[model samples]
Target chain A: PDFLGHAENPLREEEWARLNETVIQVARRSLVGRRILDIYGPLGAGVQTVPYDEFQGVSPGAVDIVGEQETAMVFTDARKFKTIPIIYKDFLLHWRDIEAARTHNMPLDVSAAAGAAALCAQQEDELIFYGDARLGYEGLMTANGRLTVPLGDWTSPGGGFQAIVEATRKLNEQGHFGPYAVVLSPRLYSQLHRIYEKTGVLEIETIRQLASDGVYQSNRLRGESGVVVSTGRENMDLAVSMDMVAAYLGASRMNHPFRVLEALLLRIKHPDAICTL
Target chain B: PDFLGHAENPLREEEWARLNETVIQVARRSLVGRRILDIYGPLGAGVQTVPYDEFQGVSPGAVDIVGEQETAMVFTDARKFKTIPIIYKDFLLHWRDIEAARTHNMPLDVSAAAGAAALCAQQEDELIFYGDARLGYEGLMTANGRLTVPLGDWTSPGGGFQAIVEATRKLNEQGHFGPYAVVLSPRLYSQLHRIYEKTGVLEIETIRQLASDGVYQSNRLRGESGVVVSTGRENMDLAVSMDMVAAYLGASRMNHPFRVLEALLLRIKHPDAICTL
Candidate 1:
């Protein structure tokens, strides 16, 4: 009671709930839920890897079963089997706090839990879309479909939407179509709103035409204004390396009553579907 | 138990106490407690505002007592009684956790509680020293008692204490006697320590001579090296606006079970009592 303040007032359940809500909001504000090309999860919990085969051509030399056709040029490009590994990370909430909530008869607050999990999700999301593809499969940011177009002068608030439309045209030329999503830096997001203020055109109207799926903002893109990702297999895929999540490590010798560990490894397949402006 | 981390470990009472201590530390780190010329708090519970009077010489001519040997000017300049409203701010400690702690024989973790009150205290501390005294009483920072001196070069590890010594001299020149304290920015603190590395002269010994009271550090003074404050009312005074603190507001219409509120308002009486370098 002394720790709380004067004995009369203490912590409340709703505030904790509010904090949890805000934690998720911060996670998304950075990179967590900006754009979801795809998600594969809870795959047979504790499973470590997913294996599959990639075939370039039919296994046996094509032969005519109906008649002995002239041996068609024997072509055996062959196929290969590959595996994606899962990785993990961990976070902790102290034991002392749990009893405090119980004693107070307050509903449990999961703010720390929400924040920790959100952190992992944000990191995975960033890696799936931006990590080096040479290490494995290409993610959208590093994929070959990357394109850059100059927005005519940032100082001029006019016709900025047209500039993005042109970028879409370039993707169209590459035989890709969208229904697309936009990921942008926070500053660029602010600039976008400012443009609307200057031109007297509501920003929602402009955004509706460019990003059909959604407009996502992230601090992950340091210098670039925005990236338009086409939502499809041609763009990207997030592969799980490990299935199990949130395991207990038990108590440590020093301070904690128990500890927790969580893990997941994401593989990004197909990098060529993202364009930048 | 799940809310904290796992059911195996619960929040402890000592940890909650420690958290409360740390929350106050963080509060002090900001503008709030950075420069406290004086503090009058925990005076009592629910005390609104402290009232006081300021006296000055009477204005204009006044009638003398009939047949009085001496001329008497009505000394109504004994300024009218005035009141300083005590402002209050509240924070909540979730009820669920309170009960949880009781059930588990654990103590309520006051990290949030302390953090909330400290936040308010910090703000109040900051305003008391730096706020506009005209609209209110001039805080120490903006008070007329301010003075400044140039330090030779922060990059150099030599003779920096001379500037502070000079400020002290100015105060002495103004007939204000010793037992002065120096408040400095953290960067300056680091620089002070670094100077010892180069010159082999400890800054503590150097400051001991300049400010008889001691040297203090705060992050609130951006770009400023230090401020010298005389420790007496002739130099400055902390006017108490409100007394009681750390109060509970009780439950309202919400999932929130109870609320916490803490308040303090201090007026800096003599502004000219501070000097900066």
Candidate 2:
């Protein structure tokens, strides 16, 4: 007997498969805009971690260490942050969409899936950059306070240019690669646009060179200037304990039984390698 | 009639009661510092309120009344700061439940409840202090302007002590009740601690006396020094209406059809009887 009452309310096996595919597709497409970690590289490593008290044994020898550490003995350390899947839900109100769902309720999954994916991306961004979403907690990006540099006379000619050069210099001094990618805040990039507009003919050659590296903006990146990072995944990348998985709970008590969960965790090898200006 | 599939996701009679209890607890715990209107006495009963559509014809009384009295307060003079409930909703996805929701499914409600409470508290704080949550409206707290004082040597000997006294003096002079309460920002309180630590010997007794009041902090206070107000509820306190309500809807052709709603508003009557340092 169908407890859901209406035959239309429950998704048949084929329908469930189709809805799951839609969720995965929606998540993958929207994931790019919501993440800063994936922009630099493919995911570092995929891992599956069990819940607490499970006694997860991770061998030091099996994992690759960034730097050489001298130690006499090798032992197993279960030092893993418990992984929790962040689930976001919202109702596609029947009254509001009664007219639309009548034809194909599948379209409703697209919006729900996309919205959930956006939220997941936000958590992924927060986890990767800060090691934790809560701002108060010192994260991977801020375990040690980030190196800060001022963009003096940032609005004038050469001022913006000088700031970028200085940041590059600092990162280079720290032994990071050059020709880095800069993620500027919207307002900060706006300053660059205004400066370019005002100087009608100053940087004929400089403008061309600056244009060589296209400008980009992000709503997630906080601050006046941008985040500067060398083009290296080892310095920073995401650690996936589990990739996004869409599962249909067969006749569950949940309102929306069709759900998608991802256990991907962020791993920042060296926060010092990245700096915000 | 069943559209949600099985039953409505809206809070049932029990869930509504449960959600209301949660909202009140959440609000009571967070409604501090963001309020500025609760610093004075009963709201000014300045004028009598006239109902809508009342012609309010003026009566000439006997013959000796003023010659040819005016018409009336026609066309309805309505001066009302209409209030609306601030509601925020996030979904609880079943697919994203592999990690956090593994134990049980209802965990999503707590997260959603706490979140709504926070949003409501922030709005209440904003409305009472600024007569608006957006900082745009000139609320009672700022209508008459607030008294401000500079902390001299805020981290020096006698500096912290003197600033507190000066604030007390000013507030007392305003004819407000004595023995006021203080709300200091974390940084401001840190300064007080630093001063006390540095002066290991001087005013040790005085510091203890001050500490007797117990140091308190708030992230929303907005300043380097403390904001002091007389410990009188009439001066400032939160006024809540129809707390939070979680309701379940019967079967609807909706996705993740569950919803939680809160009807909350802030009232800050008198704004002048407070001082910020």
Candidate 3:
């Protein structure tokens, strides 16, 4: 049998040839945006997660809080002061841990999978909320609090950028929690900068950047910024900074005023979103 | 022999039919827990708006705010606000004008159909950043705002009384917003007594009469002892005390403490929502 998979499993004998035969099989109905997981190839074992990586089970502190990367993005939130994992990463790619966040009555957010399209991930004991944008940003959880989203344009590292920002801003503005982050690859970093520059001109306060390598240690600094905010990696090169992170941390009213425009743009009409920007 | 719904020219009848269907259709599609507007005939002098009897219009505003029913709801944060047009006859029936609310950045909540639902009215016209819930709770014009479940089953004047109270209590505990209203219809007021007794043993504040010409109100007030916080139907009824009314006025805070729990139970989540409570 011409199997293209790594293991000699019965399911893979067909080489997963049926992966795209039906365009996003929605129970025999037509569905858009369906694809394969990175479980078969390079995934979960490096500085970055492979696209559609499904071989989950990254332990509580798999990704190091500090690394060698010169450019690091930090997402800080007062809630991280609790005992749960702050930037919990998984092979499936999902949320940061947030058990103590609830107990502390702290504001919350996560930097994991902010820009992922769709994924379902969970360890035997862990639970994460489903964070989907197309489905009205619905985040339904599984039995283990483990959540999943159908990989889409918004779930991938690049896709969830706006949502991550919006969610962070909402939390920040309300002082609900600290900031969240969106890690990016160098290529994606350029993309974010271009997007930020094009959209942030004469209005740069809504967005900010803090190149860093320590992914989770910035919580205190963010809390002290007088801005209930934080940051996260959008990729290896750039990280998105949301004013919401700072404002909620006691920033003494919101620093960036133009975020309103960004909020408005997020709920744009369908026709406009399709233009490959 | 007979042509139904046809005028001599046909065009006039068609216009008449369409107008009736359009706004009414829109309203029905957009509003939840609604009341059918009494067809007042047409957009002419004969089309008199039924005397809107529900007070606590909730967003009566500044710079010479005039308009009965709403002349009072405007408490602080001038900018603008949206009010659910509380109808006198029905308990859950509330009408909100979205266009007016949008002028100040209130959220526009709509039903499944693309009609503007409730207003997400907030304090100012200019946004400080990202989002606002106190603004949402106040009166808003945003669709980006999170879904706010009507607390305590107050949705139907009698749905989730205890649940609502407990939920509100939970929100209060979170320090999200200090001043949340207990806006009640005579029905809710009377029913609340029972729920209040069940949830937490309470020392009644002050009980009074309502302008209701019904026996239910009479029986409810016979042994009541809490400050009646209702629309000023009778001079001595629920409105005898503005202390409670002042609570709504002085209220202001931005937090979505309920959304997380909602997201959890429902599994579909939004970072803006808090489902823990």
Candidate 4:
């Protein structure tokens, strides 16, 4: 709405550009899911639900008798995707600060913008790896029907690599082939940095060769658990209805308030492609 | 932000105009304070604080000491207005509903927009009259320096008129003049509609003539209490940073979410101009 009067705001084009750049840079540095998973769209924000098809069919009927005694029909049932909520964070820039920066020929402080971007970015990744249970959203580590392999003690040399090898094998057994990505909790990821049984290479380096897509660590993941996924659009991708952007929320106490926000959902086409370790 | 991409939204100009009209109409019908108090501004939404001057002058010095001992200086103290937070409500309209109305040549349902507008309107009026104690904002009836007159029984004939006369006299004593407005709780407002001492004239008719500015009843005011004010810009005005407007908050669960919001504060210039009964 024009309630915020974004047009009449005191910010110049250069100031807005600077705020936008600040949000983008901070968001990029804080995000991990976008780097590992396939992105689906900058789908119009008004496009709420993603339509998918569920196949329903019975076993083929034997050619019994002359007349067709039994018959089976296969059908594609259209279904709506699960609901996912938007994530955002708000911050303010005072009018006095903006005026001072312009009049005094000094740089505008962008700490508020940076803080909001970092918060929103972190929230997005948290939603991606561990979806909100309150909203019934399922993320990579929590999706039902996904494979799970017991993690071995990562304190021992080569233990981290062995656990990943088993997780990869589980995915392969489910018909998922090469080009995989591995994501780990901080504890487990750090454990993989040790030498691998007399070999000069770090355990994570060897694991990366197997998971050719990428190997990453996330603060969102807790404890020693992590997951390995077959990375491709056939398995899953992030459906981004709205990418991150800042919107003015009107002035408060002569300070301009802005929200950094995004709308997205994780679409897992085949949950079996993910294996947790 | 372009995150919601209002420009790219599927709604046509006519559809947007309809939504805006719905919000404004609903808000107008639901508001009361705007009708009684003077409106200050469409004051750019970025204008947060309203500055005012407070006088701090000591009594005129006596011409006793020839050497001009114990001299006092008069001064104007600059002060900022109290902090008042924005009030808003959010609602959603499903995408399918919009599409259906367009395709079937049916009227679009604006219940969500209407609901948000009504809620925001009520909240604005409530804030104007009862000022949030949590934030230390003062309203007409609750202001620190306002005069108060004990209300007599309204069920007794001419009792309501007597109390009002007393209230007006109190205002007059404080040097406030004609052009007054009175606001009351529903019970007290309804009480004013009775016949005046068998004269065939309703008591409210005479009361209205005395309160030339207006007589208003609000659900925001509770119990049987009410307030009378000398209406003028010198007494009070509503400082509106942003008028009510509907803004798109993006899509969720195949529905478009929107927020109806406004930013404003009540500036009581002379608290003595108000009297509560």
Best by lDDT: 4
* Candidate 2, RMSD to the unseen true structure: 19.8
Q: How close is candidate 4 to the true structure, as a TM-score?
A: 0.52
**lDDT per residue as tens, model 1, A1-277:** 3343222223355744554454444344334433555655545434645533221212234556587656443433553333443323343333445445456442333323333443444445555556534336444556553677775655446455766787788777665675888776655554554326544543544776667788765545665467776776434445443322433444443212111122333433333345777
* Alpha-carbon RMSD, each predicted model: 28.4, 19.8, 28.2, 13.5
Give per-residue CA lDDT, model 4, range A1-277, as digits (tens): 3334433345677887888899999988889999988888777554567754333222556766587686666554466666546798988777768767878998899998998899899889888888787877888888888899988877878777788888887777767786988888888877777655566767777888887898888998888888888888867888887788877654545567777888888887777888987
TM-score of candidate 2 on Cα atoms, chains taken together: 0.38
Worst 10 residues of 4 chain B by lDDT: B1-10
lDDT value, residue A224 of candidate 4 = 82
Task: Report the C-alpha displacement of residue B6, candidate 2, in angstroms.
Answer: 13
Number of colliding residue pairs in each model = 55, 27, 97, 1
Q: TM-score-based ranking, best first? A: 4, 1, 2, 3
Residue A189, candidate 1: alpha-carbon lDDT: 54
For model 1, what is the C-alpha lDDT against the true structure? Answer: 0.49
Instruction: Identify the runs in model 3 with alpha carbons over 4 angstroms from their true place.
Output: A1-23, A26-277, B1-26, B29-277
| Candidate 1 vs 2: which has more TM-score | 1
lDDT of 3 at A57: 15
What ranges in model 4 sit over 4 Å off? A1-7, A52-78, A196-201, B1-108, B112-277
Model 2 chain A: ten consecutive residues of lowest lDDT: A50-59
Residue-by-residue lDDT tens digits, candidate 4, B133-212: 67878778788888999998888668878988999988887677868899999998888888886667999988888888
